[PDB]
Design a protein around this motif. Structure first.
Motif, short mmCIF file in Angstrom:
data_model
loop_
_atom_site.label_atom_id
_atom_site.label_comp_id
_atom_site.label_asym_id
_atom_site.label_seq_id
_atom_site.Cartn_x
_atom_site.Cartn_y
_atom_site.Cartn_z
N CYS A 14 29.75 -26.93 -4.94
CA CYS A 14 29.29 -27.64 -6.17
C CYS A 14 29.59 -26.80 -7.48
O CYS A 14 28.43 -26.66 -8.19
N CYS A 17 26.83 -25.01 -9.59
CA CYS A 17 25.69 -24.43 -8.84
C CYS A 17 25.88 -23.00 -8.42
O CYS A 17 24.74 -22.29 -8.59
N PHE A 66 19.01 -25.13 -2.59
CA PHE A 66 20.24 -24.89 -2.08
C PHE A 66 19.81 -24.26 -0.71
O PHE A 66 18.88 -23.36 -0.62
#
Length: 77
Positions: A14, A17, A66
């Protein structure tokens, strides 16, 4: 003290991220260097387990939802 802790994150792919995580970690009182192994889906922080403590590093990642999993290597090699 001042060693490498390895981490893996369930969403390395991602992009941003990881960049977010980098910055977040970068500031932390004991982190000398941020994670980067997005390439293969790992993270490698230079951390200093006196002030910060490895679980707090992991927590810090989990804050943004996460799924971090953490592998402290040893206190120095």
């Amino acid at each position: 003290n001042s060693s490498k802790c390895y981490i893996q994150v369930t969403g390395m792919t991602c992009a941003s991220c990881v960049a977010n995580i980098e910055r977040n970690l970068r500031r932390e009182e004991g982190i000398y260097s941020i994670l980067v192994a997005l390439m293969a889906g790992k993270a490698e922080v230079r951390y200093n387990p006196a002030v910060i403590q490895p679980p707090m590093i992991a927590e810090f990642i989990r804050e943004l939802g996460f799924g971090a999993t953490v592998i402290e290597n040893i206190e120095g090699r």
